[PDB]
Write a protein that binds this ligand. Structure first.
Ligand SMILES: *[C@@H]1O[C@H](CO)[C@@H](O[C@@H]2O[C@H](CO)[C@@H](O[C@@H]3O[C@H](CO[C@H]4O[C@H](CO[C@H]5O[C@H](CO)[C@@H](O)[C@H](O)[C@@H]5O)[C@@H](O)[C@H](O[C@H]5O[C@H](CO)[C@@H](O)[C@H](O)[C@@H]5O)[C@@H]4O)[C@@H](O)[C@H](O[C@H]4O[C@H](CO)[C@@H](O)[C@H](O)[C@@H]4O[C@H]4O[C@H](CO)[C@@H](O)[C@H](O)[C@@H]4O[C@H]4O[C@H](CO)[C@@H](O)[C@H](O)[C@@H]4O)[C@@H]3O)[C@H](O)[C@H]2NC(C)=O)[C@H](O)[C@H]1NC(C)=O
Ligand SMILES: *[C@@H]1O[C@H](CO)[C@@H](O[C@@H]2O[C@H](CO)[C@@H](O[C@@H]3O[C@H](CO)[C@@H](O)[C@H](O[C@H]4O[C@H](CO)[C@@H](O)[C@H](O)[C@@H]4O)[C@@H]3O)[C@H](O)[C@H]2NC(C)=O)[C@H](O)[C@H]1NC(C)=O
Ligand SMILES: *[C@@H]1O[C@H](CO)[C@@H](O[C@@H]2O[C@H](CO)[C@@H](O[C@@H]3O[C@H](CO)[C@@H](O)[C@H](O[C@H]4O[C@H](CO)[C@@H](O)[C@H](O)[C@@H]4O)[C@@H]3O)[C@H](O)[C@H]2NC(C)=O)[C@H](O)[C@H]1NC(C)=O
Ligand SMILES: *[C@@H]1O[C@H](CO)[C@@H](O[C@@H]2O[C@H](CO)[C@@H](O)[C@H](O)[C@H]2NC(C)=O)[C@H](O)[C@H]1NC(C)=O
Ligand SMILES: *[C@@H]1O[C@H](CO)[C@@H](O[C@@H]2O[C@H](CO)[C@@H](O)[C@H](O)[C@H]2NC(C)=O)[C@H](O)[C@H]1NC(C)=O
Ligand SMILES: *[C@@H]1O[C@H](CO)[C@@H](O[C@@H]2O[C@H](CO)[C@@H](O)[C@H](O)[C@H]2NC(C)=O)[C@H](O)[C@H]1NC(C)=O
Ligand SMILES: *[C@@H]1O[C@H](CO)[C@@H](O[C@@H]2O[C@H](CO)[C@@H](O)[C@H](O)[C@H]2NC(C)=O)[C@H](O)[C@H]1NC(C)=O
Ligand SMILES: *[C@@H]1O[C@H](CO)[C@@H](O[C@@H]2O[C@H](CO)[C@@H](O)[C@H](O)[C@H]2NC(C)=O)[C@H](O)[C@H]1NC(C)=O
Lengths: 105, 53, 96, 43
């Protein structure tokens, strides 16, 4: 899962199983050696501290993959990304999704 | 090399009774009472317009 | 046509032609089924599981996902096909 | 009590029959007369 995009361009990171019903995704990021950190807590909502351009796929779509849309990337966004889907048909995910890594030029 | 009938996916085919035949017999269509049937006896009649006989 | 100076005694309960409406609708309802399909090969052994859903043990899933043997268009070959039903149409016959 | 000179007028026949379910079939028996059944051609 290695995605590279020369900096200042756009970026689309997919993660997790395809959607079945209504979903509530959570995106986390992980710098190397650090603790994790929240970036997205809803389908398209972010808390304070993390800026914009980190868009999310809305959960109202049926039968799609959760994506993470980043524009104007940098060396700070170079991290390991993680998804946590909360489907209204699938059960509770006590483990996270698959580690999708971002690396920049 | 296995085949099938061509009508296997649209309908079950009613087999015709071999007792009954398909030869044509002359049917005469008769009008009920109160109605009449007019036949045009003109030779050069192309089937449209006024017939004289 | 609106009448004048006239009065009749009516009774909706011993009235006729409501019985005729009932019989006509029942027989006409029966007459719209003779061209349609009888489900003779369908009353069959149904292998049903729960619907794929976040199952709550206190409540019940109102959908059961049932796979079964069904005859194809050919009499020799038969297929395995699945569908979805409600609780109110299936019952458990008496593990598996 | 069978008499070899005469004949019993009842034959007790068991057979395969389809149930209400198309997959399962059952073994069920009944009684008939000689005048309704014939031998097809030991067993
Ligand atoms: C018979 O009657 C019964 C009842 O009498 C009817 O039953 C009702 O049926 C309707 C529809 O079936 C249900 O509506 C859903 O409601 C839920 C809950 O909505 C509430 O909460 C929302 C979020 O809460 C946040 O905001 C509020 C402030 O509003 C805040 O207090 C709270 O703490 C929290 O922070 C509110 O947004 C929402 O307000 C909305 O409605 C108001 C009504 O008038 C309106 O004034 C507001 O302006 C606002 O529009 C309400 O308070 C909703 O979640 C749900 O909508 C989501 O789900 C459907 C299906 O999946 C989807 O199509 C929608 O698009 C929507 O999904 C978006 O929102 C998610 C929220 O995070 C997001 O995660 C999704 O990804 C998706 O997000 C996308 O769009 C949004 C913009 O919408 C965008 O921001 C994102 O970036 C992304 O692009 C439905 O609205 C009722 O709950 C239900 N029951 C009752 C009691 O009413 C029944 O329908 C009747 N039947 C008939 C035949 O008449
Ligand atoms: C998929 O469905 C499952 C149900 O099988 C559901 O799991 C439940 O999640 C909730 C929260 O996510 C768990 O916690 C409950 O939360 C409510 C809200 O406050 C409390 O009131 C509950 O307390 C009651 O139940 C306790 C026993 O569980 C009692 O100790 C207590 O006194 C109250 O009576 C409770 O804390 C809930 O426990 C689970 N269910 C089970 C059986 O564990 C899950 O959330 C669903 N997933 C999705 C994505 O929808
Ligand atoms: C169940 O059915 C059997 C028949 O298979 C029956 O057995 C018969 O019982 C009788 C008496 O109980 C036997 O004896 C006969 O009795 C009569 C009456 O007197 C005689 O006339 C008979 O003589 C004739 O047959 C003889 C050969 O059996 C000849 O030698 C003689 O010249 C006569 O022709 C005869 O003695 C009878 O033999 C048996 N049958 C056989 C085949 O052995 C039995 O009683 C029945 N049981 C019940 C509870 O009903
Ligand atoms: C009902 O059960 C059937 C199985 O009989 C499911 O069909 C399978 O679904 C899985 C999940 O996508 C697939 O990997 C299989 O290939 C499917 N098999 C067939 C034959 O289709 C079906 O998804 C279930 N449906 C519901 C609504 O639960
Ligand atoms: C699948 O369906 C069966 C019923 O055929 C479920 O078994 C019981 O379901 C009720 C309510 O749905 C629960 O209260 C019982 O506790 C269940 N029995 C047992 C032994 O757990 C079953 O839970 C459903 N789900 C699975 C995964 O089998
Ligand atoms: C559909 O038909 C197949 C074939 O008869 C059934 O599979 C058999 O199931 C029995 C009981 O579980 C087994 O003893 C046999 O070994 C199976 N045979 C084969 C060829 O699989 C099956 O149960 C039927 N129903 C479904 C839902 O698949
Ligand atoms: C059972 O029925 C068979 C007939 O299918 C009997 O066989 C013959 O029956 C006649 C009259 O009933 C007798 O005259 C013959 O002698 C019988 N044949 C033999 C070889 O004995 C048969 O007797 C009946 N009873 C039993 C116990 O098999
Ligand atoms: C009812 O069905 C069973 C099952 O087919 C029949 O039993 C078979 O009989 C043949 C011929 O005697 C044997 O070769 C098989 O081994 C039998 N199979 C089983 C499972 O028993 C039976 O003949 C049918 N009829 C009756 C009256 O039982």
């Amino acid at each position: 899962t290695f995605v590279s995009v020369a900096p200042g361009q756009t970026a689309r990171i997919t993660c997790g199983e395809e959607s079945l019903g209504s979903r509530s995704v959570i995106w986390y990021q992980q710098r190397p050696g650090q603790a994790p950190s929240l970036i997205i807590y809803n389908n398209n909502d972010r808390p304070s501290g993390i800026p914009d351009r980190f868009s999310g796929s809305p959960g109202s779509t049926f039968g799609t993959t959760a994506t993470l849309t980043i524009t104007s990337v940098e060396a700070g966004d170079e991290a390991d990304y993680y998804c946590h889907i909360w489907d209204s048909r699938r059960p509770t995910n006590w483990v996270f999704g698959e580690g999708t890594t971002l690396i920049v030029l | 090399k296995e085949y099938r009938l061509i009508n296997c996916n649209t309908s079950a085919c009613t087999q015709a009774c071999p007792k009954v035949s398909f030869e044509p017999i002359p049917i005469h269509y008769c009008a009920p009472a109160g109605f009449a049937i007019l036949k045009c006896k003109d030779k050069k009649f192309n089937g449209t317009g006024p017939c004289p006989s | 046509i609106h009448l004048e100076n006239v009065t009749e005694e009516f009774n909706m309960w011993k009235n006729n032609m409501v019985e005729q409406m009932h019989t006509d609708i029942i027989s006409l309802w029966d007459q719209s089924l003779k061209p349609c399909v009888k489900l003779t090969p369908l009353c069959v052994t149904l292998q049903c599981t729960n619907v794929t859903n976040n199952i709550t043990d206190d409540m019940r899933g109102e959908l059961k996902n049932c796979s079964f043997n069904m005859t194809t268009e050919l009499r020799d070959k038969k297929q395995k096909v699945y569908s979805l039903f409600y609780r109110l149409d299936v019952v458990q016959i008496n593990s598996n």
